[PDB]
């Protein structure tokens, strides 16, 4: 058993295995799967890790051919009330990757721009799970020469614990900055959220922010209904941070090949700068990246929610809802390039696709941030 040749070999194994599941019986699928399992480790090479999570991904898809075994195997997992680990993974991604640090700086720089001269400010956060994005806002609002404005934030998440956690950290910081500030927590999933029902106090200025939360509507016109509902509030700006990869092919093959291209790039960052034995590395791959991969491969239909698409398809879709593009500023983009120079983050680079920011890793695009103005 010799290494780098196994790298190519593993790839061929995933394709050969996937073709049997997609077309025909598992007898030949089991062949490559056993062949894969001896060669893939969660703690080894980058391609060893990659094949560790795709192999289990295809197995789950095979299990769904027999609902009996799948349901029976997943029969003792109900008493699950663990959010403390869930927030731990969100903090790791925040710290170990600049994806969110760049997005947060970019949206707040974009939000500040549309809110010049506004005494009242309303921000809506879909999947408001990380407070540090707004911690930067309160700082910057107080930093501007005019002075802080009255600030309301609406937090959207499916867990009251996180919203209670965000309010506390947010309200305390506001009072210490002498900012009039109000947190309005709404507890609901994103499918069931009604945007129009949301309280709007007139005389306000509205801003909407969606961090990696738009593509879940492509599962369930579920998207176009939602964007128009945001349009119905007349937002000054809507900033959309979204993933920039074609992971929503119709077939398993087209979905698989492009999927591992992207996740291979993400796993490279982790090997380049993190020890292989660190639990933190293992906790993001298995619990964050590896969960995504399972949804892209094992799941299909409405229960498959990753559905990431490239920046172009998002631009058209957003445009169709009567949204105008706001080019991101030259000096907000300089700062993101400045974030990516320091704090390790070697190899990351950002480019501009038509007034929208694209974050890439060694010329492989990963995530896109775009600013949008409400047309008409």
């Amino acid at each position: 058993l010799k290494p780098e040749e196994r790298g190519l070999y593993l790839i061929h194994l995933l394709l050969t295995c996937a073709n049997h599941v997609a077309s025909g019986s598992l007898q030949n699928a089991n062949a490559a799967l056993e062949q894969l399992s001896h060669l893939a480790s969660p703690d080894g090479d980058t391609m060893q890790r990659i094949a560790a999570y795709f192999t289990e991904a295809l197995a789950n898809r095979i299990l769904k051919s027999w609902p009996g075994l799948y349901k029976a195997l997943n029969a003792t997992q109900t008493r699950t009330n663990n959010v403390s680990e869930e927030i731990h993974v969100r903090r790791l991604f925040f710290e170990m990757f600049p994806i969110l640090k760049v997005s947060y700086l970019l949206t707040n720089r974009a939000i500040l721009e549309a809110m010049e001269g506004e005494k009242m400010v309303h921000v809506i956060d879909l999947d408001a799970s990380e407070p540090a994005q707004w911690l930067a806002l309160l700082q910057a609002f107080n930093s501007r020469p005019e002075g802080p404005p009255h600030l309301r934030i609406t937090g959207v998440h499916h867990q009251k614990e996180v919203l209670e956690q965000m309010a506390h950290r947010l309200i305390e910081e506001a009072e210490k900055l002498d900012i009039p500030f109000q947190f309005n927590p709404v507890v609901s999933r994103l499918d069931c959220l009604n945007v129009e029902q949301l309280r709007v106090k007139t005389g306000e200025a509205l801003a909407v922010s969606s961090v990696l939360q738009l593509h879940t509507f492509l599962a369930s016109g579920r998207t176009d209904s939602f964007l128009n509902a945001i349009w119905g509030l007349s937002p000054k700006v809507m900033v959309v941070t979204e993933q920039d990869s074609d992971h929503n092919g119709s077939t398993l093959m087209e979905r698989l090949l492009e999927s591992l291209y992207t996740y291979a790039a993400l796993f490279d960052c982790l090997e380049t700068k993190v020890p292989r034995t660190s639990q933190d590395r293992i906790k993001v791959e298995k619990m964050l990246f590896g969960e995504e991969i399972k949804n892209i491969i094992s799941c299909e239909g409405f229960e498959r929610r990753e559905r990431h698409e490239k920046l172009e398809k998002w631009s058209q879709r957003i445009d169709l809802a009567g949204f105008g593009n706001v080019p991101l500023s030259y000096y907000a983009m300089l700062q993101a390039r400045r974030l990516l120079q320091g704090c390790g983050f070697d190899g990351y680079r950002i480019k501009e696709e038509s007034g929208c920011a694209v974050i890439c890793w060694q010329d492989r695009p990963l995530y896109s941030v775009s600013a949008w103005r409400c047309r008409k």
């Binding site: 780098e4 790839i11 990659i50 291209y261 490279d268 492989r364």
Partner: peptide, 14 residues
């Protein structure tokens, strides 16, 4: 490193 991203690059050409 010897890129894992490069590993698929050479295998996709084949």
């Amino acid at each position: 490193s010897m890129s894992a991203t490069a590993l698929l690059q050479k295998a996709a050409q084949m």
